[PDB]
Amino acid sequence: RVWIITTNMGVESVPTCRHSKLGEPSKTIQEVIEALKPLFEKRPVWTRRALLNHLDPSYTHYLKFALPYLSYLWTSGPFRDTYTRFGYDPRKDSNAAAYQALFFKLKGTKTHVFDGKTLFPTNRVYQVCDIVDPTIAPLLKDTQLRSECHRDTGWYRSGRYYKVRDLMREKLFALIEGEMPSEVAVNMILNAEEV
C-alpha cells in the first residue's frame, strides 16, 4: 500500500496532510520526496507521466511511494489522474484551468507534451499547460473561464472544452497509427460552431 488519499469533485475539503498510516520513509524514498518538493512549488498539480519526465529516471518506481507524502490524487473530474499538493484546491482557483487533465480512451514517445505531430505517443492523459500544439493551445488560452469549476469541464465552457477534446482525439487517432493528422480533415472540427 502506498497510502495515497484519493478525491473526487464532490469532496468538501481537499486533503491538507498525509495519510495517518504513513510513517517515516527510507532515505531512498526521502531523496525522491526532496526532488518532488520544488516541482510542486513550480506547479501544484501534476500527472505521474509529467513528473517522471522531470525526474531522475532511477525514481520511476519509487515515485508512487513518495507522492503520498506531499500530494493527494483525483480519481475523476477535470483533474483526474493528477497529484495535487496538500492544501491546494484547484476548484477554488481559476488559475488551475492551466492544470486540467484530458484523458483519451484510445488504443513510442513517453512525452507528456501534446504537440500534434510527434508519432506513436504512449501518454493518454494530457494537462493543458503541456499542450504546445499551436492550433489547439490558443483555444484554451483565449477562452473566458466559467465562474465556477464544473464537475466535468472544470473552468472551461462546455462547447469550447469539447471542441478542444475532439481536436486532440482526432489528432491522436492519426499519431498513434504513425500518420500526420490531416490539416484539412482536422480543420472541419476546428471550424465547427460550438455546441
Residue numbers in the entry: 190 to 296, 303 to 390
Please give the exact wording used by the authors of the publication that reports this structure.
Type 2 promoters contain two gene-internal DNA-binding elements named A- and B-box that are recognized by the general transcription factor IIIC (TFIIIC).
The Sfc1-DBD structure forms a compact domain that can be further divided into two subdomains. The third helix α3 is not continuous, but split into two short helices α3a and α3b. The second domain (residues 284–396) consists of five α-helices and two β-strands and adopts a novel fold with no significant similarity to any known structure. Subsequently, we will refer to this domain as winged-helix-interacting (WHI) domain. Structural comparison using program DALI identifies the winged-helix domain of Rap30 (29) as the structure with the closest similarity to the winged-helix domain of Sfc1 (Z-score = 6.1, rmsd61CA = 2.7 Å) among the many winged-helix domains present in the PDB database. Inspection of the Sfc1-DBD electrostatic surface potential identifies an extended basic region on one side of the Sfc1-DBD that could interact with DNA, whereas the opposite side appears rather uncharged. The basic interaction surface of Sfc1-DBD shows two separate positively charged patches.
